[PDB]
Amino acid sequence: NPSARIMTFYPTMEEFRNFSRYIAYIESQGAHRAGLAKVVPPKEWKPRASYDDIDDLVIPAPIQQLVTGQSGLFTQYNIQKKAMTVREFRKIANSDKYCTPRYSEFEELERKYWKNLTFNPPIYGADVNGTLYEKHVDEWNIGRLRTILDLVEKESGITIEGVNTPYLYFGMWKTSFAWHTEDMDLYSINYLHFGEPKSWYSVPPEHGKRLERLAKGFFPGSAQSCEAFLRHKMTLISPLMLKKYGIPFDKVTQEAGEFMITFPYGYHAGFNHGFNCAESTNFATRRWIEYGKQAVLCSCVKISMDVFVRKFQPERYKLWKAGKDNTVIDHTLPTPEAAEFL
Ligand SMILES: Nc1nc(-c2cc(C(=O)O)ccn2)cs1
Ligand SMILES: [Zn+2]
Ligand SMILES: [Zn+2]
After folding, report:
1. Which residues does the record give as Zn(2+) binding sites?
2. What value, to the nearest 5°, has the Cα angle with vertex 32 and ends 31 and 34?
3. Does the annotation count 180 as an active-site position?
4. Which end of the chain has less Cβ packing within 10 Å, N or C?
5. Could you say which DSSP state residue 287 is in?
6. What's the CA angle centered on 311, arms 308 and 316, to 5 degrees?
């Protein structure tokens, strides 16, 4: 993948049964270079029979997304509103004031998003604790992926909501997710259960530092206030701005029934086309260990790396605790679990 373009994968039912092995396969294919990959599930796979029984589901803290800024540079302020049901959210979403405008091609809707981002603030039904998967679904179940991230809960019982538990996101037109990498630079999985599409922008992890540098120049007050202010998830940057400053990036639209995988240190941002619902959580592979050790956290979610270093890096353990671990990450290298596909 020399241009680090977003790749799409079509596993068979057999390939879909082992989650961790398929992540290892897409890395041996070079998917991790883009920082984002699309996975289309087998036609015989269904995580839920129907979504017509969730109208009374409560969104306890919906947020009004106020956006301030100009010239492709914006700050998003999330204003907590009173709790509302899925039914109440959907009615606002499909109303004359908040529904999706007319569009023939993506570029037209994308132009409309960047032109009207600061106007008529929408409501995002974000960070809802929960799952939409039926109990019996064993394949790609966001509630129980069985990766090495499970070690945190196994050893302490500690749960970090949205990180080692699922989050639901009820979107509407122009709802957004700002530029960020995951907590502890972990991997993420996002499934679009139903509704209108979700568009994504990604910056390859091998160019991640270029975006950080650009963000520091444009918001110097924030950079002096926090070591990793992009973790506040308030910064919106248009693709025209990334193009102007030579930041390599790619874009993709996720449709209902599709998965998106984000990779360690893979910067991403995007927006919802209209009323929809996504389910998400973080996960890990052996390659993540180094990212978690080297991750720059908010200085204004921290996972203890000790258990991971002791279990998967005992040879490099003594050097790390002393502070002499001078390991440099090669963002092009696939996870060691990919060896069988190479
Ligand atoms: N670690 C985090 N990742 C997110 C996040 C949200 C979305 C979404 O709203 O669709 C998509 C991708 N990442 C938010 S906090
Ligand atoms: Zn994310
Ligand atoms: Zn901070």
Report:
1. 226, 232, 298, 300
2. 80
3. yes
4. C
5. T
6. 85
CA triple 155-158-160, angle to 5 deg: 130
Evaluate whether 234 touches 210 at the Cβ level (below 8 Å): no
Distance CA 25, CA 21 (A): 6
3-state secondary structure of 318: helix
Beta-carbon neighbour count of residue 110 at 10 Å? 19
The torsion of the CA quartet 302, 306, 308, 312, rounded to 10 degrees, works out to 150
Cβ–Cβ contacts within 10 Å for residue 239, how many? 16
Ligand 3 centroid, distance to 230 Cα (angstroms): 8
The angstrom resolution of this structure is 2.1
DSSP state of 165: S
Which residue's CA lies nearest to atom 12 of ligand 1?
A: 177
| Structural tokens at position 18 | 């082992």
Rounded-to-integer distance, Cα 137 and Cα 132, Å: 11
The tokens for 232 are 């506040």
Question: Could you tell me which residues are beta bridge partners of residue 32?
Answer: none
Distance, CA of 184 to chain centre: 13
Contact 124, 175 (CB under 8 A): yes
Domains, the chain, with CATH or none: 6-342 (2.60.120.650)
Contact indicator for 85, 59 with CB cutoff of 8 Å: yes
Report CA Rg, the chain.
Answer: 20
Q: Which of helix, strand or coil describes residue 212?
A: helix
DSSP class of 118? T
Could you say which DSSP state residue 148 is in? G
Ligand 1 atom at minimum distance from 272 CA: 10
Nearest to 163 by CA among 335, 305, 301: 301
Question: What ligand has the least distance to the C-alpha of 63?
Answer: 1
CA separation, residue 297 to residues 20, 61, 213, 230, 289 (Å):
26, 25, 16, 10, 15
